[PDB]
Amino acid sequence: MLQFSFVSNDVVMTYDEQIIWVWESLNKFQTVCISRIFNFQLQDLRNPPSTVQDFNDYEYSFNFGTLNNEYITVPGRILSINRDVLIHKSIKLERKVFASERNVSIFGRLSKLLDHTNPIIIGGDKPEAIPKSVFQELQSKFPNTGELDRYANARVHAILAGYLDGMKDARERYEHYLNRKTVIRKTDKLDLEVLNKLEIEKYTLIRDIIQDALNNKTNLSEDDWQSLMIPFITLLFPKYIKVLEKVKIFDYYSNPSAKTNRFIDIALVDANGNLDIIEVKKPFDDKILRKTPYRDNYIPTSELSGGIMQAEKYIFHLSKWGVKGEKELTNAYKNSLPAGMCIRISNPKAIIIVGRDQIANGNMTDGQLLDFEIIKRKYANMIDILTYDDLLRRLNNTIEALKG
Amino acid sequence: MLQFSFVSNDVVMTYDEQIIWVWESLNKFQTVCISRIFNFQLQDLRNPPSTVQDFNDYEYSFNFGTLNNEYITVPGRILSINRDVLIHKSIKLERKVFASERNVSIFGRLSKLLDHTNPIIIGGDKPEAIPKSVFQELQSKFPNTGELDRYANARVHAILAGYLDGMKDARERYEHYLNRKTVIRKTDKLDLEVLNKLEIEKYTLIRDIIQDALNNKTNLSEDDWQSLMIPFITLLFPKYIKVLEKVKIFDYYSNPSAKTNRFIDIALVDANGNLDIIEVKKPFDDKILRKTPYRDNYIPTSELSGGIMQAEKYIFHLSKWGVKGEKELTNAYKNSLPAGMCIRISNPKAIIIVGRDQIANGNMTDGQLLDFEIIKRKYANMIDILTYDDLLRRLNNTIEALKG
Amino acid sequence: MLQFSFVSNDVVMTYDEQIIWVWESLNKFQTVCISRIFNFQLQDLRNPPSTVQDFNDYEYSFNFGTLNNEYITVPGRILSINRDVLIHKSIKLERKVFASERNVSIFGRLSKLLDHTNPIIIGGDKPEAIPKSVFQELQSKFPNTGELDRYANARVHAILAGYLDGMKDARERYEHYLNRKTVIRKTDKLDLEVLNKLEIEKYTLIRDIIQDALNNKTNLSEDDWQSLMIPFITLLFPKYIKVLEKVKIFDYYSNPSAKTNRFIDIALVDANGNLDIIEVKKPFDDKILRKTPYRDNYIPTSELSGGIMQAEKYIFHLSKWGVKGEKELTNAYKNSLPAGMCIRISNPKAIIIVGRDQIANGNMTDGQLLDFEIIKRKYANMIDILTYDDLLRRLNNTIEALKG
Amino acid sequence: MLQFSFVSNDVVMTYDEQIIWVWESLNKFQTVCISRIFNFQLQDLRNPPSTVQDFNDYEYSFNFGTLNNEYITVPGRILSINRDVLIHKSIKLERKVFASERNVSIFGRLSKLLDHTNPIIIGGDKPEAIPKSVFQELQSKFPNTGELDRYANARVHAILAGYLDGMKDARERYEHYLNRKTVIRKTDKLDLEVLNKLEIEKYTLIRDIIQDALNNKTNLSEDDWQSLMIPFITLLFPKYIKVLEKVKIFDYYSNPSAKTNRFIDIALVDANGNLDIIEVKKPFDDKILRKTPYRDNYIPTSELSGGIMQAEKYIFHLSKWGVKGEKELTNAYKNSLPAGMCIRISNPKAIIIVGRDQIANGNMTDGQLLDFEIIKRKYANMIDILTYDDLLRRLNNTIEALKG
């Protein structure tokens, strides 16, 4: 048992059954550990017990550092910490303040975290002091009996969750109790404003170049347009880490007698190594939609349909190539790919950039807008269908979100 | 010093100071507790030690249960467990099997978890039996008094660190990124090569902070962990321009008479304005794959299945909400969203980052690796299934591609 | 321009320069086509023309029909039909009642359709007389100049619809005008009731045999269970025409150095040769769900997860095998398949029949029911997930629909 | 008789009951019409017939067109149409090119279809140009007095057949099936072999009736065609227990201010209750792919695209309707559905039977056949895409598999 009392200048704690070990260890090392949190020298003991007196019969009295300036001063050596600690009179000195549950040295953990050598002060009129109410809040937050039991139940539950059925939901209860506690402070966060500003600077530059190319560049060929957009594709689509050109694939459907080589003009490699196809096509007023609806339904134009068919054919040829194709593609592009990465077909999908939307023009009526959205999601293989005006709108939305 | 042997298909535990007290306690309470894990009735004791017999030369013998059908059947009363305890014959009986570290009853914690009274079975082909390898993992990863103290030391340190400096390590990494960004961007004008170098610095910064969070911020609450990754989610997934928290959806399936409001902890909005869901789960469980394959095929862990189920339930409610949901969400988040963008619930999908694959260890076999890849792609509404280790590898692949 | 008048109680047709040609044709052959709908002869001429008389001055006079009992009787030869035609006095006599637009013989078409040789009767009190109201309705149904123009516009529209892209969508106009006029009679539709009763008999026989196996034949092993279900699998799922057993599949992912053979126990071939996998598993109470929900979400049981994974592995191996797999499978099963059918892997999907819902014997909570439905529609490859109780419910629904 | 020659890059047509009268008609009307297809003004005549010249000795020469830019430009006045007609130089000018059988101008009908004043262009690489092969298909299929008369005769025959014994041919096929069913099932005890034989008879009956409808009664209204196939829809797709006609759905996207009612012509409800959509399109063309490939890729025809678009729009409205849709649909069709079964919109899918592939002809090339299959599987939200010939082939495959 530990009883804490203050007499005049010094504050003395009393250890209250076999205390023979304490005396022996105190003699052996000139230091004993009381409750794993107190380190006292033979000098610290107010009176050494006589070898003739029974150590168990003797009541041990260990002395803390002298209190002054209305603050109890406790030596660093007793807590085995470099910085000494100051405790206010208003807090009643006790073991709960010194140690948390499981004999955790609250002051010791605090000392390791604090790089400054300035002595810790609690509930003091001094500016560098812990608010007493907040210090009590930290004590409540520290793990307590039954919080450890919830963690223990959760750890065993996680190991046998599949193996054992009928086990109580220990993990859910432990997480819920932990969720009520909020270790992090919302005010102390990372602004990340400079990083966001650089992202805006990157998005604006890509948006400005593509917009300028639509406005003034029509002379350049479709292949020249592909080359212009090839650097931007990696930044517009960060999921695809590498861009591959003229990817030869093998055909076993167009000609049964002999394989026919097919060349994907632009292909995309995911960080996972999955393979996707991107089709870049010359922008036109209406290369994405027709002029007259069929049977009261707007339909995709020959240009868009042909572009979807080209990408669909390449995906179909890759799906047939399967594992053999991945090995051939991996060996051909191993240097291009980051080391430890292999191309995997993984059900290839296609990204299409055809024409410019008339929504910006305002020519498209609400019924046309509905059909335009449906044409965009009509094909599963074409995960995303985009128009150059739509791509600019997506860039504008991303820039606005970063700005806000 | 306990020795376990089987006589006539009946298990016998033999124990070998003064053991006279053990006989006195057995008579006084009709029971004795030995090692703090085993309780034996006076009837249970195999041989009564007579007073004339020398206790020093006598070794206590107690029935430890009966070996039936190749299964050792320790009585529940011995471990003070309401349900029976069964061990396989191949698993050698030891004090370590029943007690971990400082006399911690391993079976006791498992019994508290099991609401059902069905007997615990360890080893063998029994359907409810726990595999010997999993039981060995449970012994090693059991929350022993030392492990509980380690958790308490970590939790106390985390609470003090969060109050003292918040995300100090993340801020230091951000300051390093800012210095690198200034060196790379000597000129205000931006080039594609300059943008790629800035992207490498941004990706390294995000990856370094995530690794630091995994190493020291794991003990944080699930709500606190989501807050740490919420700014990074927009950067890790640029497609999703905005991140929304505590989104409210309507559930009519659970109670037809009255709708029940459900809350999505994190939701992602893309530039198109389509709504998707993201789940960031604290990696409490070390493995995202079950230790033993159910039938030569590795199966998803309960933690992975739970995260998938919770997201699927959210996606199901969003699809059911339909147009009414899009209008309600758009009005609620109109200020948050960039102007001219409306929340549309079309084809809602989910991205889940849960647990750690630890392919770095190399424990996974070629078949196990194949099963893990199939599980990542097995779920229809989870476009990306990720683990914290997998996310770090994807970040590394992006950095290498930008470098080359 | 033909005029019909009654002289001597008989109809007279007057024909209004081709008049000289008609006289020359009358000399060459007795039969002369007037308006392409009427055949007339020298005997029919009331007043035959002569060369000396001016043809232009002369007015043709013919005997059209003889009126008997106040009913006009028209000979078969004039309309070139075997049976005579009767016209009621009240019904006007003109070219339009005799012929539709484009000189289409209404009576000639009707005579071919009528198997009976009884003379066609229009109006009058005769038992088989066609009512005047009905005859006028038939005339309105017959195509007019506007419908012929609309059909002509529709025919040209379809040929160049993709090319010009500037047409007025005349197809939609023509189809809409056609839709307003329905020439079918609701009574004519086949009862098909006798066939539907036979379908109920087939469904009841399958339902009862599956039911008898569930409740009584639990003795059969899983291989024995699959064998009993294989004949029913085609009937339960008619889309899959053929059942393949022990289908050898080349596997490269499990062991890269050496290919490994995976044997799909039951495989299904679509009429188009598409390949699907069916997994028949022994039924058990529940076995589609875990007893305890994980974090308030019920998760798939280990047995269900293992079954889904095994089917997913077979689908994954087939996709990797790709076109080479299709050729190998076609060669192995060409004899079993109908001639002209080749096994095309395409996108392989799996149908899983595992466990029992447990809903009927013990009511499940609404959350359990929602999770059970979600699990079935969770995995993409598992298009259909069923329980034996679900199969009986599906059979009951089909039987009830056929009854009603 | 008309001869076209190219002198000095100018196209001139020469012709040879008196030509002098034609010259007089030019003085009377300031214009003349020749062959009923060509109208020539006074300026058009290349060389005037001098009185001294024997009108007969001179051959009436008229300037027909100007040859410029490697093209033959024909003035609109010559064809009496507002828009000019351009014929490629490689295409020989013939009366057949500008005139169908019995002087039916081919260009005049096309001019009526085209709302825009842009000139019709035939041959060449221009996108607005119509391919020569398609123009040859137009010439052969162009409506002419014979073709229109043939359509009118067939329509009149169908109207009379609808009036008397509409489904008489179908009744005869059903009677044959009933006689065959009696011969097969004499035991009165269902057997798997007996069921297979009954299934073959049911499949043959459906296949024969569908084949008869293709051959005759095709001219019937699209609504009549849907009603004809509506009983067989459940038999063709047995998973779908019930068929719903004119299913009202709520559309909010088309008009923001108010919802607009949309009717699904035919909707399919399965045993689960998952509502699906089937489109039955009356075949009007023998091509489901464009006659000329877009850049070596065969695009889907307008009819196929329009039917898919209509199904996609219905699926989109159902997904937006969500839970509200499930309630309204279930209440409206609760009596129609088996008791205890409710419509669940879930993910709507569409089945489309449109036009005829004519694969049986063998006209399609291997690349065209590959494009055909890819188009059927390239559309999301579609379970399958079917043609009437493809549906018959599927029925044949089921019959052969049942036989063995």
Ligand SMILES: [Mg+2]
């Ligand atoms: Mg979460």
Ligand SMILES: [Mg+2]
């Ligand atoms: Mg329709």
